[PDB]
Design a protein around this ligand. Structure first.
Ligand SMILES: [Sm+3]
Length: 325
């Protein structure tokens, strides 16, 4: 069962009530580039899954359960307090993400929140290298047909040397090193079975990766509502069985005549109440970003060529655009 009354397990967090939807900054914040990193310790997926066996999340709010589906979620926000790598807006991104999901009544069975902000209601643990890795394995490990997964990262993205690649920096990166995108892809995407939907939001400043995903679409300045966009194949081969959807920000691909963009994109998308298609919704989001003086335009990437005429959702399997090979 899912907890449906506030008396079941007692009082649950009202994140909207704490002002996390409308009373926090939804403006860009500055992300200073971390710079080149030494080579990371590569992920041992077996150890990751081993270390994930004891772990659980909690139900963050009551909502109406979706029949035949369970929802699990992992949220990671890192402000790197006290360091030269300090960021002002990453844990705040998680705040808005959490409030937006609540406001929309996404019925999450178990959530894990890894933030470095003190006294953050519902904080599970610190976003260390070992916690990010093991909780990533936690998120995907019990995935059965019908399951819905949600992943959110706000923090530094950077490049690191190989023994270059894109990588994200845990709060303890100084001591434990970064995590390469190859390993994130292997943990979070590669192990999903068929008929499992995942949405992953990566809000990391500069490193606008798409995590080795085969399909992408960038909603650049020249796209119009009265156009018909399609995803493109940008990588040969595919190791992802499940339905993975990734939201991130990149530089405009239109030829010309930092922090918080990916989070505004997915929150604006969700807060739009009118059941728009991926395509129409991305135009509106692109306009919102330009309005609020974001550097980035929205980028949708996926493990299949999504028909962008399909309605946007967090819970549904993809309708495939057969015209994309
Ligand atoms: Sm890579």
């Amino acid at each position: 069962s899912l907890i449906t009354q506030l008396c079941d397990a007692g009082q649950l967090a009202d994140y909207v009530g704490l002002g996390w939807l409308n009373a926090v900054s939804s403006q860009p914040y500055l992300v200073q580039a971390l710079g080149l990193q030494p080579p990371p310790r590569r992920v041992d997926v077996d150890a990751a899954f081993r270390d994930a066996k004891g772990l659980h999340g909690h139900q963050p709010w009551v909502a109406t359960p979706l029949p035949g589906q369970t929802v699990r979620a992992l949220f990671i926000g890192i402000n790197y307090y006290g360091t030269s790598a300090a960021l002002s807006g990453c844990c705040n991104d998680v705040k808005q993400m959490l409030a937006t999901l609540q406001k929309k009544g996404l019925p999450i069975n178990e959530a894990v929140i890894l933030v470095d902000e003190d006294n953050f209601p519902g904080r599970t643990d610190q976003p260390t290298r070992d916690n990010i890795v093991r909780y990533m394995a936690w998120l995907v490990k019990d995935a059965k047909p019908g399951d819905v997964l949600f992943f959110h990262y706000s923090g530094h993205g950077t490049q690191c040397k190989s023994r270059y690649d894109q990588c994200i920096a845990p709060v303890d990166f100084q001591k434990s090193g970064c995590i390469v995108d190859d390993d994130i892809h292997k943990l979070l995407f590669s192990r999903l079975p068929e008929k499992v939907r995942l949405t992953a939001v990566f809000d990391c400043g500069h490193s606008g990766s798409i995590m080795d995903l085969p399909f992408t679409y960038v909603c650049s300045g020249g796209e119009q509502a009265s156009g018909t966009p399609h995803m493109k194949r940008i990588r040969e081969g595919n190791d992802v069985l499940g339905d993975v959807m990734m939201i991130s920000g990149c530089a405009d691909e239109q030829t010309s005549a930092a922090g918080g963009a990916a989070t505004q994109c997915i929150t604006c998308m969700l807060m739009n109440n009118q059941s728009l298609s991926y395509g129409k919704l991305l135009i509106e989001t692109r306009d919102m970003l330009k309005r609020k003086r974001f550097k980035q335009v929205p980028q949708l990437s996926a493990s299949k060529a999504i028909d962008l005429d399909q309605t946007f959702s967090l819970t549904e399997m993809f309708s495939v655009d057969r015209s994309i090979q």
